Amino acid sequence: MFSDLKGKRILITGSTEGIGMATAIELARYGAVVGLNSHVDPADPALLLGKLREAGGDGAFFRADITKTAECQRLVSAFVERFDGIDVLINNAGGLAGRSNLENIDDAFYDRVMDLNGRSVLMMTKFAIPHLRASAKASGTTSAVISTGSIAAREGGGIGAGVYAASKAWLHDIHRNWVKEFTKDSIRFNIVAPGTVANSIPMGRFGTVQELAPAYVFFASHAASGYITGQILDVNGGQICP
Amino acid sequence: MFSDLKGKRILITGSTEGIGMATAIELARYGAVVGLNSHVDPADPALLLGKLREAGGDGAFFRADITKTAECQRLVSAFVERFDGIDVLINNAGGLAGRSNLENIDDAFYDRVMDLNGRSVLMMTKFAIPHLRASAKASGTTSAVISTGSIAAREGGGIGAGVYAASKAWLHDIHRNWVKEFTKDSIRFNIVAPGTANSIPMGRFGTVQELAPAYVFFASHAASGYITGQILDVNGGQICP
Amino acid sequence: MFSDLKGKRILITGSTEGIGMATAIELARYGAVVGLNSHVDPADPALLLGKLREAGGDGAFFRADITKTAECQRLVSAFVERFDGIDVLINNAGGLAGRSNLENIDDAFYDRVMDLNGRSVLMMTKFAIPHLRASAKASGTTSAVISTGSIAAREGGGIGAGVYAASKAWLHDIHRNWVKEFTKDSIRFNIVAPGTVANSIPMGRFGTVQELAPAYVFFASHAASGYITGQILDVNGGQICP
Amino acid sequence: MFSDLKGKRILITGSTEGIGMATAIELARYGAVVGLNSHVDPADPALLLGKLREAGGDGAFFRADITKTAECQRLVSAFVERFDGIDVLINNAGGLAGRSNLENIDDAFYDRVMDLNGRSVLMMTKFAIPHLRASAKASGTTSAVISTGSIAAREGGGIGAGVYAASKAWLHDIHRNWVKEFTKDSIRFNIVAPGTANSIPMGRFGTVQELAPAYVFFASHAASGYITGQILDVNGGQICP
Numbered sequence: 001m002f003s004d005l006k007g008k009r010i011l012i013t014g015s016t017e018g019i020g021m022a023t024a025i026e027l028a029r030y031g032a033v034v035g036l037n038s039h040v041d042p043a044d045p046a047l048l049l050g051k052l053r054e055a056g057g058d059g060a061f062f063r064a065d066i067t068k069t070a071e072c073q074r075l076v077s078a079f080v081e082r083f084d085g086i087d088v089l090i091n092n093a094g095g096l097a098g099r100s101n102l103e104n105i106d107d108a109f110y111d112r113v114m115d116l117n118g119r120s121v122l123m124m125t126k127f128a129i130p131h132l133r134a135s136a137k138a139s140g141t142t143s144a145v146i147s148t149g150s151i152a153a154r155e156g157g158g159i160g161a162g163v164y165a166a167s168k169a170w171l172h173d174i175h176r177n178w179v180k181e182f183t184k185d186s187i188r189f190n191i192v193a194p195g196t197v198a199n200s201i202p203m204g205r206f207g208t209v210q211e212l213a214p215a216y217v218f219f220a221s222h223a224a225s226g227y228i229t230g231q232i233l234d235v236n237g238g239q240i241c242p
Numbered sequence: 243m244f245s246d247l248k249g250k251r252i253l254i255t256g257s258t259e260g261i262g263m264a265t266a267i268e269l270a271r272y273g274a275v276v277g278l279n280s281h282v283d284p285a286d287p288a289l290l291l292g293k294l295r296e297a298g299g300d301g302a303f304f305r306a307d308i309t310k311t312a313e314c315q316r317l318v319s320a321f322v323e324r325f326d327g328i329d330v331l332i333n334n335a336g337g338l339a340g341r342s343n344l345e346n347i348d349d350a351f352y353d354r355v356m357d358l359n360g361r362s363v364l365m366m367t368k369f370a371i372p373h374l375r376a377s378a379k380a381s382g383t384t385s386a387v388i389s390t391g392s393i394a395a396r397e398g399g400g401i402g403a404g405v406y407a408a409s410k411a412w413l414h415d416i417h418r419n420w421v422k423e424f425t426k427d428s429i430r431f432n433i434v435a436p437g438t439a440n441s442i443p444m445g446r447f448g449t450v451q452e453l454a455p456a457y458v459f460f461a462s463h464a465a466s467g468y469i470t471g472q473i474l475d476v477n478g479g480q481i482c483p
Numbered sequence: 484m485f486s487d488l489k490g491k492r493i494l495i496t497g498s499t500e501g502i503g504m505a506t507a508i509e510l511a512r513y514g515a516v517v518g519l520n521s522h523v524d525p526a527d528p529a530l531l532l533g534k535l536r537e538a539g540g541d542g543a544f545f546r547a548d549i550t551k552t553a554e555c556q557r558l559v560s561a562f563v564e565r566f567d568g569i570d571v572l573i574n575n576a577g578g579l580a581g582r583s584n585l586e587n588i589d590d591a592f593y594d595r596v597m598d599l600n601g602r603s604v605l606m607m608t609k610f611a612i613p614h615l616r617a618s619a620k621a622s623g624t625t626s627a628v629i630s631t632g633s634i635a636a637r638e639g640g641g642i643g644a645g646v647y648a649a650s651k652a653w654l655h656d657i658h659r660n661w662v663k664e665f666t667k668d669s670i671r672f673n674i675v676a677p678g679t680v681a682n683s684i685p686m687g688r689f690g691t692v693q694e695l696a697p698a699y700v701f702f703a704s705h706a707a708s709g710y711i712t713g714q715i716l717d718v719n720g721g722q723i724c725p
Numbered sequence: 726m727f728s729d730l731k732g733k734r735i736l737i738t739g740s741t742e743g744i745g746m747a748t749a750i751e752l753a754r755y756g757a758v759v760g761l762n763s764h765v766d767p768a769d770p771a772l773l774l775g776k777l778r779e780a781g782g783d784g785a786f787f788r789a790d791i792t793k794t795a796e797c798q799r800l801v802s803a804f805v806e807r808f809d810g811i812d813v814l815i816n817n818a819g820g821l822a823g824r825s826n827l828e829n830i831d832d833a834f835y836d837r838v839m840d841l842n843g844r845s846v847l848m849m850t851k852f853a854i855p856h857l858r859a860s861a862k863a864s865g866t867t868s869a870v871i872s873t874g875s876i877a878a879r880e881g882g883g884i885g886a887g888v889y890a891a892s893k894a895w896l897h898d899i900h901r902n903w904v905k906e907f908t909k910d911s912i913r914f915n916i917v918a919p920g921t922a923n924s925i926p927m928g929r930f931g932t933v934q935e936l937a938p939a940y941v942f943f944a945s946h947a948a949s950g951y952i953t954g955q956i957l958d959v960n961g962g963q964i965c966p
């Protein structure tokens with residue numbers, strides 16, 4: 001029972017596939033209204049919305065390359081134009097964007113990874129704060145941000161992935177800064193931290209997207225996680241037990 | 243969608259009131275057969291079965307003092323005699339059991355606190371294992387332990403409660419041990435860590451109602467099937483680890 | 484330069500060998516006065532004191548089985564009788580005291596490990612607090628406790644070692660409780676956390692006692708670590724990077 | 726006994742004042758040849774060499790702006806031209822570079838903060854590596870990086886300083902990455918994490934004098950030769966992780 005998610009307007013960056021899409025459908029199951037998003041158009045946008053509505057909810061697609069601040073602005077504007085505000089921001093866009101030994105790491109590499117995993121999440125969240133704040137007065141209860149983190153935030157990632165690791169630790173920490181700045185506004189901030197999606201994983205296998213979605217649902221519903229904020233749930237098969 | 247909780251046999255310690263009852267109820271909402279528990283008999287046993295049954299499930303009460311190892315064995319054997327198995331165990335029993343500054347701590351105090359928060363958890367978990375082992379063999383999925391931690395494990399607790407604090411740090415960490423030993427038996431282990439009020443960002447205290455959903459989440463293979471060895475801190479941001 | 488350790492009276496439990504003895508000698512190098520200790524008499528007590536004095540300092544041996552509270556009392560009494568107080572308590576006694584799969588863990592096993600790693604450190608520290616407090620008024624500066632922890636406090640130890648792991652996490656946390664109770668008394672509390680003393684260790688080898696001693700020296704000198712309290716230094720070759 | 730610091734070539738960024746100078750001095754006490762550094766020329770360069778020389782060692786000042794990657798390369802090349810190597814690098818440069826609430830953060834702010842605390846560290850470390858690689862090959866022991874972290878990496882920092890906070894969390898964690906890549910080159914990485922006053926158990930602030938010894942400890946193979954990937958928090962108990 002996440003019935004308090006019916007009608008909730010939930011914007012998810014980087015959600016035309018993987019964890020993002022699977023989460024979109026699970027939110028849809030409780031009748032949520034979901035902004036899908038990506039930097040390039042999917043092959044079949046209607047089919048994705050079909051899957052949402054099929055599952056019991058609704059939504060629209062919005063294309064934006066959120067490694068640019070302007071685009072994060074434009075994306076929040078559009079979703080808010082279409083529906084009238086945001087009840088939940090899910091920062092899911094992110095990713096490696098390459099591996100490089102430290103000695104071959106030039107400025108471009110740094111900038112690529114940090115725009116994808118750093119600036120994007122900062123700026124998206126910034127532009128959504130206004131609407132999330134207002135969303136929360138209106139409901140009475142709370143708005144939410146959920147950001148996708150990583151096991152790499154904690155243990156430094158694989159070789160090649162130092163910047164990605166660091167960018168994720170950057171996120172885990174900046175959430176703690178936002179719990180300070182915005183709990184008075186009744187906006188909660190939580191992280192799902194995938195791990196990888198064997199045999200340094202106690203369970204002996206990589207996760208499936210269907211195994212990551214429920215946690216997002218959990219942090220999304222105020223009825224289920226209303227007292228929880230500034231926490232990190234690692235969904236990694238025991239791979240790290242912090 | 244917690245429908246896989248239908249018929250799940252869920253023994254809960256320290257469950258006649260507080261977080262324990264709340265959690266029993268919420269689980270009972272999904273057709274869980276819950277074992278309620280306390281050292282003392284409660285005033286109205288059948289209300290409590292009522293609440294479970296009202297909510298959508300079933301259960302039974304067992305008196306037992308878990309600060310003792312024979313009692314723990316008994317409780318697990320009683321629960322199994324009644325329901326033929328364990329699918330989820332929830333180590334919720336625990337508490338301060340007094341307050342004392344270091345200079346005033348004797349063996350009796352230390353023994354009281356650690357028997358309540360350490361030995362209990364250890365032994366309950368020890369005796370449940372082969373039952374939980376068998377459940378997951380049968381279901382094809384995973385069985386589950388959940389235990390009630392505390393903010394105090396992370397930041398040391400408050401003056402006079404060092405032993406309780408450390409008992410909780412002890413639990414947090416021994417759960418990491420069990421992940422190593424038992425993940426191959428398809429048994430998951432997770433912890434719900436209640437916080438304790440101008441040091442709590444949400445300006446206020448938790449309520450049992452705000453705690454129980456967490457436990458439901460960790461109890462369900464469909465929800466948290468790939469999650470083990472974690473601690474979900476439910477505390478209005480009191481600490482953000 | 485740890486010249487501020489000359490004459491400092493430093494009681495170290497479980498110090499007739501391993502990390503304990505090596506630490507004793509390194510403190511001795513700066514002219515400290517060191518209580519050695521163990522639950523059984525060494526073969527040659529004079530040779531150990533010889534090594535202390537040889538290195539540039541002094542001390543005495545005190546036998547006590549500190550798994551009993553009475554003995555911790557008796558041990559602190561004796562060291563304080565001999566010298567007139569304690570400037571530094573080093574809780575080094577501890578250890579596995581067996582491995583057991585959880586299903587074979589009876590009460591005795593629990594009790595053995597917890598007395599060795601839990602009650603001992605609690606009670607030793609308790610009985611020393613009085614004297615450490617007074618030591619600190621007299622000096623002006625600070626007293627110190629240093630406790631030997633473990634990598635196992637953080638990641639749950641090896642199979643068989645769950646109670647030992649847990650007992651060490653217990654210690655890491657209870658120190659945080661004592662930073663609260665006793666910083667007003669100018670008593671600092673720090674932990675050295677050995678790890679193991681290969682190839683899940685970046686350095687590819689186990690530590691040597693000579694590689695653990697310096698850290699104890701560091702936390703022992705007020706001139707070097709006077710502003711540091713409630714911290715844990717892991718000395719493990721990168722084995723865990725918290 | 727830090728005698729192995731004799732003749733060690735120790736490039737330090739952000740070292741004309743504060744923790745950086747203090748640390749240079751203390752290292753200079755053991756016969757270290759230190760590289761002082763700032764974006765701006767200081768008033769009296771030779772006093773500073775004086776302090777190093779007085780204390781027991783030697784050194785040289787290099788102007789460079791490390792928020793820029795070409796400048797970082799230059800500094801490492803300059804330092805090597807002068808002293809023929811690097812044995813220790815200390816990434817101490819960094820700071821708030823302004824304060825801003827989230828709703829007022831533009832790209833320029835973010836770029837300013839991360840260039841100062843992220844790019845700098847990364848690039849300094851990148852360019853030093855092969856020098857540090859060569860030192861440890863020659864010594865037979867280990868060479869060393871030390872970097873100045875912050876309490877803020879752990880608890881989020883204060884309102885208006887999110888980016889700085891996260892920049893420090895970023896550093897803490899990338900040091901873990903480097904341990905993996907570079908431990909086999911015998912290069913250690915450790916972090917000294919200054920705290921920032923009724924939330925500090927010692928009722929008071931740190932002083933540069935209370936900070937520098939830590940750095941000395943991490944700088945010496947004899948002292949900290951088996952220590953890598955750690956963060957020593959110097960903060961009067963402000964946080965106890």
Ligand SMILES: NC(=O)c1ccc[n+]([C@@H]2O[C@H](COP(=O)([O-])OP(=O)(O)OC[C@H]3O[C@@H](n4cnc5c(N)ncnc54)[C@H](O)[C@@H]3O)[C@@H](O)[C@H]2O)c1
Pocket residue numbers: 255256257258259260261262279280281282306307308309334335336337338390391392393394436437438
């Ligand atoms: N609420 C807080 O401030 C806080 C903070 C940190 C942790 N916790 C943890 O929350 C958990 C549960 O607390 P609670 O909500 O049930 O509060 P509570 O006051 O209701 O605890 C009493 C409950 O546990 C049972 N109980 C007590 N001793 C028992 C024993 N020896 N054997 C069997 N049952 C026993 C009682 O009968 C009752 O059901 C504990 O483990 C506690 O350490 C609470």
Ligand SMILES: NC(=O)c1ccc[n+]([C@@H]2O[C@H](COP(=O)([O-])OP(=O)(O)OC[C@H]3O[C@@H](n4cnc5c(N)ncnc54)[C@H](O)[C@@H]3O)[C@@H](O)[C@H]2O)c1
Pocket residue numbers: 738739740741742743744745762763764765789790791792817818819820821873874875876877919920921
């Ligand atoms: N003291 C605190 O409150 C506190 C708390 C957390 C972290 N820190 C960290 O302490 C470290 C050092 O602080 P500090 O003691 O030197 O204080 P500081 O005020 O002295 O910092 C200025 C120093 O760094 C140099 N510097 C500044 N920008 C530079 C640049 N672009 N290139 C080269 N050099 C530059 C200055 O010339 C000077 O030597 C920083 O990384 C900071 O983030 C400090």
